Design a protein around this ligand. Structure first.
Ligand SMILES: CCCCCCCCCCCCCCCCCC(=O)OCC(COC(=O)CCCCCCCCCCCCCCCCC)OC(=O)CCCCCCCCCCCCCCCCC
Ligand code: HEA
Ligand code: HEA
Ligand SMILES: CCCCC/C=C\C/C=C/C/C=C/C/C=C\CCCC(=O)O[C@H](COC(=O)CCCCCCCCCCCCCCCCC)COP(=O)(O)OCCN
Ligand SMILES: CCCCC/C=C/C/C=C/CCCCCCCC(=O)O[C@H](COC(=O)CCCCCCCCCCCCCCC)COP(=O)(O)OCC[N+](C)(C)C
Ligand SMILES: CCCCCC/C=C\CCCCCCCCCC(=O)O[C@H](COC(=O)CCCCCCCCCCCCCCC)COP(=O)(O)OC[C@@H](O)CO
Ligand SMILES: CCCCCC/C=C\CCCCCCCCCC(=O)O[C@H](COC(=O)CCCCCCCCCCCCCCC)COP(=O)(O)OC[C@@H](O)CO
Ligand SMILES: CCCCCC/C=C\CCCCCCCCCC(=O)O[C@H](COC(=O)CCCCCCCCCCCCCCC)COP(=O)(O)OC[C@@H](O)CO
Ligand SMILES: CCCCCCCCCCO[C@H]1O[C@H](CO)[C@@H](O[C@H]2O[C@H](CO)[C@@H](O)[C@H](O)[C@@H]2O)[C@H](O)[C@H]1O
Ligand SMILES: CCCCCCCCCCO[C@H]1O[C@H](CO)[C@@H](O[C@H]2O[C@H](CO)[C@@H](O)[C@H](O)[C@@H]2O)[C@H](O)[C@H]1O
Ligand SMILES: CCCCCCCCCCO[C@H]1O[C@H](CO)[C@@H](O[C@H]2O[C@H](CO)[C@@H](O)[C@H](O)[C@@H]2O)[C@H](O)[C@H]1O
Ligand SMILES: CCCCCCCCCCO[C@H]1O[C@H](CO)[C@@H](O[C@H]2O[C@H](CO)[C@@H](O)[C@H](O)[C@@H]2O)[C@H](O)[C@H]1O
Ligand SMILES: C[C@H](CCC(=O)O)[C@H]1CC[C@H]2[C@@H]3[C@H](O)C[C@@H]4C[C@H](O)CC[C@]4(C)[C@H]3C[C@H](O)[C@]12C
Ligand SMILES: C[C@H](CCC(=O)O)[C@H]1CC[C@H]2[C@@H]3[C@H](O)C[C@@H]4C[C@H](O)CC[C@]4(C)[C@H]3C[C@H](O)[C@]12C
Ligand code: CUA
Ligand SMILES: [Cu+2]
Ligand SMILES: [Mg+2]
Ligand code: NA
Ligand SMILES: [O-]
Ligand SMILES: [Zn+2]
Lengths: 43, 227, 58, 79, 84, 259, 514, 46, 98
C-alpha cells in the first residue's frame, strides 16, 4: 500500500481534539447514569 | 468450598472427584504442550530473513498433522470414557434423599422410613454469625451420614435449577416433572458447599447448598429430631 | 382470450428511464405512495405502542 | 426382606439417571395390587414392597397430587 | 409393489391425462363413497376433568378467552365441562 | 453497456416495505396477544400483501416484458427455489421431532402411554384417507399440466391446472371441517399441540400452494408461458409436490402410527 | 438520489457498507452491555439490584454481539463486498432480495430493544429455556419481543444464504471450477449451508415457545405431557452449528491475510483448507448434546457426544498447521492486520483446547454452568471472531473507502486490545475451576480478586473501542488516497481501484480452458 | 449515475472533518449511551 | 390434436434473452456464457480476448487444476504474457451497436 499525502492533514492539535471529543462522547453520558445510580433505586 | 486467589479445583472430598483431578491433570499436560509447540513454532517462522515464496507440497506433512492429533485424542478419551462409565456403575446405596428446587430455595425429602421434609434458605448477609461465609450458609443443612453410598434424586417444582456440590464432583439439573438420579459418597466428614448452576430468576445467586456429613449414629437422631 | 404479451413488452422496454415499479403509469404511483404511507404510518404508530407499553398503568 | 429394608435397590429395568418411570411404575404396582387384594378378600400386606419403593423415590407433591386425582377420578393411568 | 399396470411410452400429456381420469380421480370418488358412508356424528365422549387436557395457562386473545378457534359446542368441552 | 448475461435490478422500494411490513406484523401480533388489539396487525398484513403483489409484479415485468431472464438468470432461479425448499424441510423436521419426542416416551402426566388418556383420535381410514387421495391425485393432475404446457396444449394445461387447484381447494375445505369436528383442541396438551401446529402449518402451505397455482393459471390465461420458458410454473409444481410428501409423512406419522 | 442509493439499493457493495455500519453500531451497544456486566462483578455485593435486571443485561449482551455485530459484519458486510469481486461477478444473483436481508435487521434489533424496556425485560439467557422463559415466570411481552427479534433475524440470514450459495455456485467465470475460488469464498458458501439448515429448526423451537406462552400448547410444559428438554435439543441442534457459522469466515480472512502479508502467491494446502471447513461444518451438526451433559441422559449417549465433539480437533488442527506453513519462508510485512491474524492463531488455539476439556462429559459435570465455559468461548469469539473482524477491517478498509489508516495508531489499537481481553478472560479460567457459577450478579467473598482483575481488563478493552472510533475519523479527516497495492495478480478484489466503481465486472473477466 | 471514488461511496459526507466528528460522536455515542439509559428506565419504574 | 395456443421462444422471447437465443444459433457467445478455448499461446499464436473497451481483466489458470488464477489488466497493443507461465494474450476490440 502506497498512498498520496493527506489532502486535509490533521495536525497534532486537530488529532488531540478528535481524541478529546471521542473519549468524552462515550465517557460523559455513561458517567451521568452511573453517578445518579443511587437516586434511581429510591423509587 | 473455594478460598481466596484459588487457581485450580476444590479438594476432592469424594473419590470420583479425586479421579477427575488426576484426569484433569492429564488433559492439561497436553493443553500446556500444544499451546507451547504452537507459540514456539509461530516465533520460529517469524525470526528468519531466509525465504521460500514458491509453491510448497502438502500430502506428506498433512499426514503427521492428522495421525499425531488422532493418537493425542484417543489418549484423552480412553480415560474420559473410563471415568464416565465409572460414574454409572452397579453401586449399592443405603439412603435415598430427594431434593426439590424452588424460586429460590431447596426443599429436602428423606422418606425411606419416615415422612421427613424441610426447606433450606440462605442466611441474609445482615444475619450471619461472625465467621459465617456470605452467600453460602443455609439455615437448615443437608445432614448426610459420611462414608456411605447415598442416592440423590433431583427435580424442581417450578423453573430449572441445578444441584451442584463441586468438592464431591456432583452437578445434576432439577427438571420439573423429571426425577434425575446421582450418587453421593463422602470420604470425609465436615461442611461441603454449592450453589444453583442454572439461571432461575431474581435470586439464582442466592440459593445455595451445604452438606453436613457426620457419622451414621449422629444422623439417625438428627432424622428423628426433625419430624 | 388473445395474446397481448407484445403490447405490454413495448410499454416496458420504452426508454422513459422510469424504474420498473413505475413503468405501468399513474396506478403504480398510487399503489407505491399508498403503500409507503401505511408502512411509515404504521411504523410511527408501532413506536407509540412500544412507548406506551414501556411504563406501568392504571 | 422388608425387615431389613433400608431403601430401593437398583432395578435392572431402570438403569439410567432418569428414574421418573421408577417412581411411576412402583406407584401403579401398589394401587393395582391393592385394588386386586381388596376385590378377592386377601391381605394388602403383599402390596407393601411397592408402597415403600414408590415412597423412597417419589417426591411428596407427586404422590399428594396422584392421590387427589384417584379420589377426583382424573388419574390418567389405568388401575 | 402392491401395484401393476405396464409402461405406456406413447405420449406425455396424454398418458398423465389417462392416469388423471383413469386412476387419480376414480380414487377420490371411491375414497368419497367410503367417507360419505363412514362419516356421521359418532357418540360424544363423557367429560372427565383431566388436568393434562383443556389447558388454560393464559386466556386466548379472542372470544371470552376460554374457547378455542374451531370450538364446537357439541364435541368440545370447556375446562369445567360441556356447554348446553 | 453490459457484456454478461445476468440481471442488474433497478432500485426497488419493496425490500424496505417488506422489512417494515415485518415490524408491523410482529409488533402487531404482540399487540393482539397482550393488549388484545388487531389495529397494528391488519396494518402490517395489508402493507405485506401490497409489498408481495408489487414485488412479484415487477419480477414478471422483468421476465415476460423486458426479457431479462437469460438462460443464466433462470438457472440461478432453480438453485434458489431448491435451497428454499430445503429451508421449509428443516422447519417441518423440527415439528416431526417434537412429535417423535412426545409419542415415543409418554410422561406419567398423560397416562405414561400414547395416545394419552382422554384423547379420542380420528380414524385414519375416514376423511384423512380421502385427504391423502385428493393430494396424490393433484400430483397426477399438475404433472399432466406440465406435459400439456411442454407439448403446447394451452387448453389441456388449463383443464389440468384447474383440476389441481380445485383439489387443493377441496383438500382445504375438507381439512377445515375436520378441525371443527375434532373432539380435541390445540389446548389438549402435547397431542393437540403437535397435531394442530404441525397439520396446521402444513395447511397454510397448501393455501400458499393454491395461491401460487392460481397465479400460474391467470398468467397462462394471458399467454405469459412458452413450451420452454415457464419457471414460475416449475417453482409452483416443486412446491406443490413438497406440500404433498410432507402431507404423506404427517398421515403416516401423526394419523396412522400415532392413532 | 440518496433515497434511491442507500434505501432502495441493489448494489452488492452499497449493501455491504450498510451492514459494516449496522454491525459497528451494534458493537457500541454490545460493549456498553459488557462493561455494565463487569461494573456489577468488579466488587462484591450488589450494584444494579437482583439477578433479574442483571440477566436482562447479560442476555442482551449476547444477542447483540452474536446476531447484530459478528454475523452482520462478517457475512453481510465482507460477504457482500468481497465475494462478487473474488469471483468476478457483477453483483449477487438476487440483489433486491439482498437489500431486504439488510432492512429486516433494524426492525429485528428494535424488537430486542423493546423487550428490555417492556415489563422487567427478558433475563432468560440467550438460550431462552422454558420454564423460566414461559408465561408464568416471564409473563409479559418481553420474551415474545425477543422471539420476534430472532424470527426476523433468521429470515435475513436464510434469505442471505440462498443469495450467496446461488451467487458462488452460478455466477463464476465459466472456465472457473469451484476449486479455483478463494478460501473466503469457500468459507461463506459453507457458512450459508450451516445457516440454511440450522436456522429453520431454531425458528421451529422459538415458535413452539410463542405457542406455549400465547395459544395454550404444552410442548415444553409437563402439565400437558411436554418436556422442557425437547426445547434444549431443537435450540442446540441450531446452536452448535451457530458457532462454526461465527468462526468459518474468520478462517477465510485469516487464510487471506497470512497469505498476503507473508508475500506468498497462495496459502499452503488449498484443498486441505477446503476439506477442513467442509468437515468442521459437517461434524458441527452431530455434536449438539455436549451442551446438555447435566440434564440426565443415558451414559452411552453422553460418551458418543464426548467422542464426536473431540473429532473436530483433527480438521481444525490441519488449518492451524496450514496457516503456520503459509508463514514458513514468507517475506513477513509487520502490518497491523498481520498482528490481528497472528493473535487469532494463538488465542483461537487456547480457546479451542479449553473446549476439548469441555468435550469430556466427566469434567463438564463440574465445569458446566461455571465461568470456565465463559472463558473458553470468550477466547474463540473475543480473541478469534473479533480478531478476524479487526484484521479484515484493517486490511480491507482502503478498498471500501479509498483511504489509508495510520498504521502506528492501528498497532497502538491492537496493543491495548491484546492486554484488555487477556486480562479480562485469563482469570475466568481460575474462577470456574474454583466453581464460580455463571449468571450471578454477586459472588462468595473467595472469588473477589479475579473478579476485580477481570473487570479492570474490561476497562482497558474500552480505551481500545474508543480509540478505534477516533482512528476511523483521522483517516477520513486526513483523506490519504491509496495509490498502489501489491500482490494484485493473486488478489482480484484490489484490481478495480480503491474504492472500486459502482458497477464492477460490467465486462466479465476472460478465463480460457487449456 | 451515482458519484464514483473516494469519500463518494458512503451515505454520509466527509467533505468537512468537524461536521464528520459531530456525526461519529452521535452515531457511536448514542449506541453506547443506549444500554445505560435503558438500565436507568428499568430501575426508575419499580 | 393440440390446437397449440402456447407461444414458443422463437415467437415471444424479447430483450437480452432473445439476443442470446439469436446469437447462439449463429455460433457466437457475445454475452460470455461459454468458456473460450485456448491457443498454443505463443507470440505468433496468442490468445485473442474480444473486448468492448481498451482494457479487460484476463485470468490465467497456468496449469490444469491449479488452485490460483493469475489476474491482470489486458490493454490494446502488443500481445501481453501472463507474469506466471508467460502465455500470450491479445485484445480484439469490436462493438454491439446494430
Ligand atoms: C494478568 C492476568 C492474571 C494472571 C494470573 C497469574 C496468577 C498469579 C498468582 C500466583 C501464581 C502461582 C502459580 C503460577 C501458575 C498460574 C497458572 C497455572 O499454570 O496454574 C496451574 C493450574 C491449576 O493447578 C493447581 O491446582 C495449582 C497448583 C499450584 C502448585 C504450584 C506450587 C505452589 C505455587 C502456586 C500457589 C498455589 C498452590 C496451592 C494450590 C494447590 C492446588 C490448587 O491452572 C490452570 O489449570 C489454568 C488453566 C489455563 C490453561 C491455559 C493454557 C495456557 C495458555 C498459555 C500457554 C503458553 C504461555 C504463554 C502466556 C501468554 C498468554 C497468557
Ligand atoms: C466461535 C465460537 C466457538 C468456537 C470456535 C468453539 C469451539 C469448540 N467448542 Fe465451544 N462454545 C461456544 C463457542 C465456540 N466454541 C459458546 C458460545 C458456548 C456456550 C454457549 C453457552 O452455553 O452460553 C460454547 C460451549 C462449549 C461446550 C459446553 C460447555 C458447557 O456448557 O459446560 C463444549 C463441550 O464440548 C464446547 C466444545 C468445543 C470444541 C471441541 C470446539 C472446537 O471447535 C475447538 C477445536 C480447536 C482446537 C482444539 C484448537 C486447534 C486444534 C489443534 C491445534 C489440534 C491439536 C489438538 C489436540 C490433539 C486435542 N463448547
Ligand atoms: C460475539 C459474542 C461475544 C463478544 C464479542 C463478547 C465480548 C465480551 N463479553 Fe460476553 N458473552 C457472550 C458473547 C460475547 N461476549 C455470550 C454468548 C455469553 C453467554 C450469555 C449467557 O449467559 O446467556 C457471554 C457472557 C459474558 C459474561 C458472563 C455473564 C455471566 O455469566 O454473568 C461476561 C462477564 O464478564 C462477559 C464479558 C464480555 C467482555 C468484557 C467482552 C469484551 O471482550 C468486548 C470488548 C469490546 C469489543 C470486542 C467491541 C468490538 C466491536 C467491534 C469490533 C465493532 C467495530 C467494527 C466495525 C466498525 C466494522 N460476557
Ligand atoms: C384449514 C387450515 C386453516 C389454516 C389456519 C387459518 C387461520 C389461522 C391460522 C393461521 C396459520 C398459522 C398457523 C400457525 C400457528 C398455530 C397453529 C394453528 C392451527 C389451528 O388452526 O389451530 C386451531 C386452533 O387455532 C387457534 O388457536 C387460532 C390460531 C390463530 C393464531 C395465529 C398464530 C400466531 C403465531 C404464528 C407464528 C409465526 C411463525 C412464523 C415463522 C416464520 C419462519 C421462521 C385448531 O382448532 P381447535 O379449535 O383448537 O381444536 C379443534 C376443536 N374442534
Ligand atoms: C506437528 C509438527 C510437525 C512439523 C512437520 C515437519 C516437517 C518436516 C520436513 C522437513 C524438510 C524441510 C522442507 C522445507 C524447506 C523447503 C525445501 C526446499 O526448498 O526444497 C525444494 C522444494 O521444492 C519443491 O520441489 C516443491 C515441493 C516442496 C517440498 C518442500 C516443502 C515441504 C515442507 C513445507 C511445510 C512447512 C511446515 C513447517 C511449519 C509447520 C526442492 O528443491 P531441490 O529438490 O532442488 O532440493 C535439493 C536439496 N538437497 C540436495 C540438499 C536435498
Ligand atoms: C503518548 C500519546 C501521544 C500520541 C502518540 C503518537 C501517535 C501516533 C502518531 C503516528 C505518527 C506517524 C507514523 C509514521 C508513518 C505512518 C503515518 C505518517 O506519518 O503519515 C505520513 C505523513 O507523512 C508526513 O510526514 C507528512 C506530514 C504529516 C505527518 C503526520 C503525523 C503528524 C502528527 C503525528 C502526531 C500526533 C499526535 C497525537 C496526540 C494525541 C504518511 O504515511 P507514510 O509514512 O508516507 O507511509 C504510509 C503508507 O501507507 C503510504 O504509502
Ligand atoms: C400471512 C401471509 C401468508 C402468505 C400468503 C400468500 C403468499 C404468497 C402467495 C404464493 C406465492 C406466489 C409467488 C408468485 C410470483 C410470480 C412471479 C413469477 O413466477 O416469476 C417468475 C420467476 O420465478 C420466481 O421468481 C420465483 C418465485 C417464487 C416465489 C416463492 C413462493 C413461496 C414464498 C411464500 C412465503 C412463505 C412464508 C412462510 C410461511 C410461514 C418469472 O419467470 P417465468 O414465470 O418463467 O417468466 C417467463 C416468461 O414470462 C417469458 O418467457
Ligand atoms: C410472523 C411473521 C414473521 C415474519 C415473516 C415475514 C417476513 C418477510 C415477508 C416478506 C417476503 C415477501 C416479499 C417477496 C420476496 C420475494 C423474493 C424473491 O422471490 O426473490 C427471487 C429469488 O428468490 C428465490 O427465487 C428463492 C427464495 C424464495 C423465498 C421467498 C420469500 C421468503 C419469505 C419468507 C421466509 C420464511 C423462511 C422459511 C424458512 C423458515 C427473485 O430475486 P430478486 O432479487 O427479487 O430479483 C432478481 C431478478 O432477477 C428477478 O427477476
Ligand atoms: C463505565 C463507563 C464510563 C466509566 C468512566 C466514566 C468517568 C465519568 C466521566 C465523567 O462523567 C461524569 O463526571 C462527573 C462526576 O465526576 C459527573 O458530574 C456529576 O457530579 C458533579 C459534582 O460531583 C456535578 O456538579 C455534576 O452536575 C454531575 O452531577 C457528570 O455528570 C458525569 O458525566
Ligand atoms: C395511516 C396508517 C396508520 C394508522 C395508525 C392509526 C390507528 C389509530 C387507531 C386507534 O387505536 C384503536 O385500536 C383498537 C381498534 O380496534 C382498539 O383496541 C381495543 O380492541 C379490543 C376489542 O377488539 C378491546 O377489548 C380493547 O379494550 C382494545 O383497547 C383501541 O381501543 C383503539 O385505541
Ligand atoms: C407422489 C406424487 C404423485 C405424482 C408423481 C409425480 C411424478 C413426477 C413425474 C414427472 O414427469 C416425468 O416422468 C414421467 C414418467 O416417467 C414422464 O412421462 C412420460 O414422458 C414421455 C415423453 O414426454 C412419454 O413418452 C412416456 O409415456 C412417459 O409416461 C415424463 O416424461 C417426465 O417429465
Ligand atoms: C402467520 C400468519 C398470522 C395469521 C393471523 C390470523 C388472524 C386471526 C383473526 C382473529 O379473529 C378474530 O375475529 C373477530 C374480530 O374481528 C373476533 O371474533 C368473535 O366473533 C366470533 C364469531 O365468528 C365468536 O366466536 C367470538 O365471539 C369472537 O370473539 C375475535 O376478536 C377473533 O376471533
Ligand atoms: C483427494 C482430496 C482432494 C485433493 C484433490 O483432489 O485436489 C485430498 C485433499 C485433502 C486430503 C485429506 C487431508 O489432506 C487430510 C488427510 C491427510 C492424510 O495424509 C491422508 C488422509 C486425509 C484425510 C486426506 C485425504 C485426501 O488426500 C484429501 C481428501
Ligand atoms: C377462456 C378459455 C377459452 C379461450 C382460450 O382458449 O384462451 C377457456 C379454455 C379452457 C377453459 C377452462 C377449462 O375448460 C376448465 C374449466 C371447465 C369448466 O367446465 C368451466 C370452467 C373452466 C375453468 C374453463 C374456463 C374457460 O372456459 C377456459 C379457461
Ligand atoms: Cu435456582 Cu438458579
Ligand atoms: Cu457447542
Ligand atoms: Mg446448565
Ligand atoms: Na456484584
Ligand atoms: O462450542
Ligand atoms: Zn499463466
Amino acid at each position: 500500500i502506497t498512498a498520496k499525502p493527506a489532502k486535509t492533514p490533521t495536525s497534532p492539535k486537530e488529532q488531540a481534539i478528535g481524541l478529546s471529543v471521542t473519549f468524552l462522547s462515550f465517557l460523559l453520558p455513561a458517567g451521568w447514569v452511573l453517578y445518579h445510580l443511587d437516586n434511581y433505586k429510591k423509587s | 468450598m473455594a478460598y481466596p486467589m484459588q487457581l485450580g479445583f476444590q479438594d476432592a472430598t469424594s473419590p470420583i472427584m479425586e479421579e477427575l483431578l488426576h484426569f484433569h491433570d492429564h488433559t492439561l499436560m497436553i493443553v500446556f504442550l500444544i499451546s507451547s509447540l504452537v507459540l514456539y513454532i509461530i516465533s520460529l517462522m517469524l525470526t528468519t530473513k531466509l525465504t521460500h515464496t514458491s509453491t510448497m507440497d502438502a500430502q506428506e506433512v498433512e499426514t503427521i498433522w492428522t495421525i499425531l492429533p488422532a493418537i493425542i485424542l484417543i489418549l484423552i478419551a480412553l480415560p474420559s470414557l473410563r471415568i464416565l462409565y465409572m460414574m454409572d456403575e452397579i453401586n449399592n446405596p443405603s439412603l435415598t434423599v430427594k431434593t426439590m428446587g424452588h424460586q429460590w430455595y431447596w426443599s429436602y425429602e428423606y422418606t425411606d422410613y419416615e415422612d421427613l421434609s424441610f426447606d433450606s434458605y440462605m442466611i441474609p448477609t445482615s444475619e450471619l454469625k461472625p465467621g459465617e461465609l456470605r452467600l453460602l450458609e443455609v439455615d437448615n443443612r443437608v445432614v448426610l451420614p459420611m462414608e456411605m453410598t447415598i442416592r440423590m434424586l433431583v427435580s424442581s417444582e417450578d423453573v430449572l435449577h441445578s444441584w451442584a456440590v463441586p468438592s464431591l464432583g456432583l452437578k445434576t439439573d432439577a427438571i420439573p416433572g423429571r426425577l434425575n438420579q446421582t450418587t453421593l459418597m463422602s470420604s470425609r466428614p465436615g461442611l461441603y458447599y454449592g450453589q444453583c448452576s442454572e439461571i432461575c430468576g431474581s435470586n439464582h445467586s442466592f440459593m445455595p447448598i451445604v452438606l453436613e456429613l457426620v457419622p451414621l449414629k449422629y444422623f439417625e437422631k438428627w432424622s428423628a429430631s426433625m419430624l | 382470450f388473445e395474446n397481448r404479451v407484445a403490447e405490454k413488452q413495448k410499454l416496458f422496454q420504452e426508454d422513459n428511464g422510469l424504474p420498473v415499479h413505475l413503468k405501468g403509469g399513474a396506478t403504480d404511483n398510487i399503489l407505491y405512495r399508498v403503500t409507503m404511507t401505511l408502512c411509515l404510518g404504521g411504523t410511527l404508530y408501532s413506536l407509540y405502542c412500544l412507548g406506551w407499553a414501556s411504563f406501568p398503568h392504571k | 426382606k422388608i425387615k431389613n429394608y433400608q431403601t430401593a435397590p437398583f432395578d435392572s429395568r431402570f438403569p439410567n439417571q432418569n428414574q421418573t418411570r421408577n417412581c411411576w411404575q412402583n406407584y401403579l404396582d401398589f394401587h393395582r395390587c391393592e385394588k386386586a387384594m381388596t376385590a378377592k378378600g386377601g391381605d394388602v400386606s403383599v402390596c407393601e414392597w411397592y408402597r415403600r419403593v414408590y415412597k423412597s423415590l417419589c417426591p411428596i407433591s407427586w404422590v399428594s397430587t396422584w392421590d387427589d386425582r384417584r379420589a377426583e377420578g382424573t388419574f390418567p393411568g389405568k388401575i | 409393489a402392491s401395484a401393476a399396470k405396464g409402461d405406456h411410452g406413447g405420449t406425455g400429456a396424454r398418458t398423465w391425462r389417462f392416469l388423471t381420469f383413469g386412476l387419480a380421480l376414480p380414487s377420490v370418488a371411491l375414497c368419497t363413497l367410503n367417507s360419505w358412508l363412514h362419516s356421521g356424528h359418532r357418540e360424544r365422549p363423557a367429560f372427565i376433568p383431566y388436568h393434562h387436557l383443556r389447558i388454560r395457562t393464559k386466556p386466548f386473545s379472542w372470544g371470552d378467552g376460554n374457547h378455542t378457534f374451531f370450538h364446537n359446542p357439541r364435541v368440545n368441552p370447556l375446562p369445567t365441562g360441556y356447554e348446553k | 453497456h453490459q457484456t454478461h448475461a445476468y440481471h442488474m435490478v433497478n432500485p426497488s422500494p419493496w425490500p424496505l416495505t417488506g422489512a417494515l411490513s415485518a415490524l408491523l406484523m410482529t409488533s402487531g401480533l404482540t399487540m393482539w396477544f397482550h393488549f388484545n388489539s388487531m389495529t397494528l396487525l391488519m396494518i402490517g398484513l395489508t402493507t405485506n400483501m401490497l409489498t408481495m403483489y408489487q414485488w412479484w409484479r415487477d419480477v414478471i415485468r422483468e421476465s415476460t416484458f423486458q426479457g431479462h431472464h437469460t438462460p443464466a438468470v433462470q438457472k440461478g432461479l432453480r438453485y434458489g427455489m431448491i435451497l428454499f425448499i430445503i429451508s421449509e424441510v428443516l422447519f417441518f423436521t423440527g415439528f416431526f421431532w417434537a412429535f417423535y419426542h412426545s409419542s415415543l416416551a409418554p410422561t406419567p402426566e398423560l397416562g405414561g402411554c400414547w395416545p394419552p388418556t382422554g384423547i379420542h383420535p380420528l380414524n385414519p381410514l375416514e376423511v384423512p384417507l380421502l385427504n391423502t387421495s385428493v393430494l396424490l391425485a393433484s400430483g397426477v393432475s399438475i404433472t399432466w399440466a406440465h406435459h400439456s404446457l411442454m407439448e403446447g396444449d394451452r387448453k389441456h394445461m388449463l383443464q389440468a391446472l384447474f383440476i389441481t387447484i380445485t383439489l387443493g381447494v377441496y383438500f382445504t375445505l375438507l381439512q377445515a371441517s375436520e378441525y371443527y369436528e375434532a373432539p380435541f383442541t390445540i389446548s389438549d396438551g402435547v397431542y393437540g399441540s403437535t397435531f394442530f401446529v404441525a397439520t396446521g402449518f402444513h395447511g397454510l402451505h397448501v393455501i400458499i400452494g393454491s395461491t401460487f397455482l392460481i397465479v400460474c393459471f391467470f398468467r397462462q390465461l394471458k399467454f405469459h408461458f412458452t413450451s420452454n420458458h415457464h419457471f414460475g410454473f416449475e417453482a409452483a409444481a416443486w412446491y406443490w409436490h413438497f406440500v404433498d410428501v410432507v402431507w404423506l409423512f404427517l398421515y403416516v406419522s401423526i394419523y396412522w402410527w400415532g392413532s | 438520489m440518496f433515497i434511491n442509493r442507500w434505501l432502495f439499493s441493489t448494489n452488492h457493495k452499497d449493501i455491504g457498507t450498510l451492514y459494516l455500519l449496522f454491525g459497528a453500531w451494534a458493537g457500541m451497544v454490545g460493549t456498553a452491555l459488557s462493561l455494565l456486566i463487569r461494573a456489577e462483578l468488579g466488587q462484591p455485593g450488589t450494584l444494579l439490584g437482583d439477578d433479574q435486571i442483571y440477566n436482562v443485561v447479560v442476555t442482551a449482551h449476547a444477542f447483540v454481539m452474536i446476531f447484530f455485530m459478528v454475523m452482520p459484519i462478517m457475512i453481510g458486510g465482507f460477504g457482500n463486498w468481497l465475494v462478487p469481486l473474488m469471483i468476478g461477478a457483477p453483483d449477487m444473483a438476487f440483489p433486491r432480495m439482498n437489500n431486504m436481508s439488510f432492512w429486516l435487521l433494524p426492525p429485528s434489533f428494535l424488537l430486542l430493544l423493546a423487550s428490555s424496556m417492556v415489563e422487567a425485560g427478558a433475563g432468560t439467557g440467550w438460550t431462552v429455556y422454558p420454564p423460566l422463559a414461559g408465561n408464568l415466570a416471564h409473563a409479559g411481552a418481553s420474551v415474545d419481543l425477543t422471539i420476534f427479534s430472532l424470527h426476523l433475524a433468521g429470515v435475513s440470514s436464510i434469505l442471505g444464504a440462498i443469495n450467496f450459495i446461488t451467487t458462488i455456485i452460478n455466477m463464476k467465470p465459466p472456465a472457473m471450477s469451484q476449486y479455483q475460488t478463494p478460501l473466503f469464498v469457500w468459507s461463506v458458501m459453507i457458512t450459508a449451508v450451516l445457516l440454511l439448515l440450522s436456522l429453520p429448526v431454531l425458528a421451529a423451537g422459538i415458535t413452539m415457545l410463542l405457542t406455549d406462552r400465547n395459544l395454550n400448547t404444552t410442548f415444553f410444559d409437563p402439565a400437558g405431557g411436554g418436556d422442557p428438554i425437547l426445547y434444549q435439543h431443537l435450540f442446540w441442534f441450531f446452536g452448535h452449528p451457530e458457532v462454526y457459522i461465527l468462526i468459518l469466515p474468520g478462517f477465510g480472512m485469516i487464510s487471506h491475510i497470512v497469505t498476503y502479508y507473508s508475500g506468498k502467491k497462495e496459502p499452503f494446502g488449498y484443498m486441505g483448507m477446503v476439506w477442513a471447513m467442509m468437515s468442521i461444518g459437517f461434524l458441527g451438526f452431530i455434536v449438539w448434546a455436549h451442551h446438555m451433559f447435566t440434564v440426565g441422559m443415558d451414559v452411552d449417549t453422553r460418551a458418543y457426544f464426548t467422542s464426536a465433539t473431540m473429532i473436530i480437533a483433527i480438521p481444525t488442527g490441519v488449518k492451524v498447521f496450514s496457516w503456520l506453513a503459509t508463514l514458513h519462508g514468507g517475506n513477513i510485512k509487520w502490518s497491523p492486520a498481520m498482528m490481528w491474524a497472528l493473535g487469532f492463531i494463538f488465542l483461537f488455539t487456547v480457546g479451542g483446547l479449553t473446549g476439548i476439556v469441555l468435550a469430556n462429559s466427566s469434567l463438564d459435570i463440574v465445569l458446566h454452568d461455571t465461568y470456565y465455559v465463559v472463558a473458553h468461548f470468550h477466547y474463540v469469539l473475543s480473541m478469534g471472531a473479533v480478531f478476524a473482524i479487526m484484521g479484515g477491517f484493517v486490511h480491507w478498509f482502503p478498498l471500501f473507502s479509498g483511504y489509508t489508516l495510520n498504521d502506528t495508531w492501528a498497532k497502538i489499537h491492537f496493543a491495548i486490545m491484546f492486554v484488555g481481553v487477556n486480562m479480562t478472560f485469563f482469570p475466568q479460567h481460575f474462577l470456574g475451576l474454583s466453581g464460580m457459577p455463571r449468571r450471578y450478579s454477586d459472588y462468595p467473598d473467595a472469588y473477589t480478586m479475579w473478579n476485580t482483575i477481570s473487570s479492570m481488563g474490561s476497562f482497558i478493552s474500552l480505551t481500545a473501542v474508543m480509540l478505534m472510533v477516533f482512528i476511523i475519523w483521522e483517516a477520513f479527516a486526513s483523506k490519504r488516497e491509496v495509490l498502489t497495492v501489491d500482490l494484485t495478480t493473486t488478489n482480484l478484489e484490489w484490481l478495480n481501484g480503491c474504492p472500486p466503481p459502482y458497477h464492477t465486472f460490467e465486462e466479465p473477466t476472460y478465463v480460457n480452458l487449456k | 449515475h451515482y458519484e464514483e471514488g473516494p469519500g463518494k461511496n458512503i451515505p454520509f459526507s466527509v467533505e468537512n472533518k468537524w461536521r464528520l466528528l459531530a456525526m461519529m460522536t452521535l452515531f457511536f455515542g448514542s449506541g453506547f449511551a443506549a444500554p445505560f439509559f435503558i438500565v436507568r428506565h428499568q430501575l426508575l419504574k419499580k | 390434436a393440440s390446437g397449440g395456443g402456447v407461444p414458443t421462444d422463437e415467437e415471444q422471447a424479447t430483450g437480452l434473452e432473445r439476443e442470446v437465443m439469436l446469437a447462439a444459433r449463429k455460433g457466437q457467445d457475445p454475452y460470455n456464457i461459454l468458456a473460450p478455448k485456448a491457443t498454443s499461446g505463443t507470440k505468433e499464436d496468442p490468445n485473442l480476448v474480444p473486448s468492448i473497451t481498451n482494457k479487460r481483466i484476463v485470468g490465467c489458470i497456468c496449469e490444469e487444476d491449479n488452485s490460483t488464477v493469475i489476474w491482470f489488466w489486458l490493454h490494446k497493443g502488443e500481445a501481453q504474457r501472463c507474469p506466471s507461465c508467460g502465455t500470450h494474450y491479445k485484445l480484439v476490440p469490436h462493438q454491439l451497436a446494430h
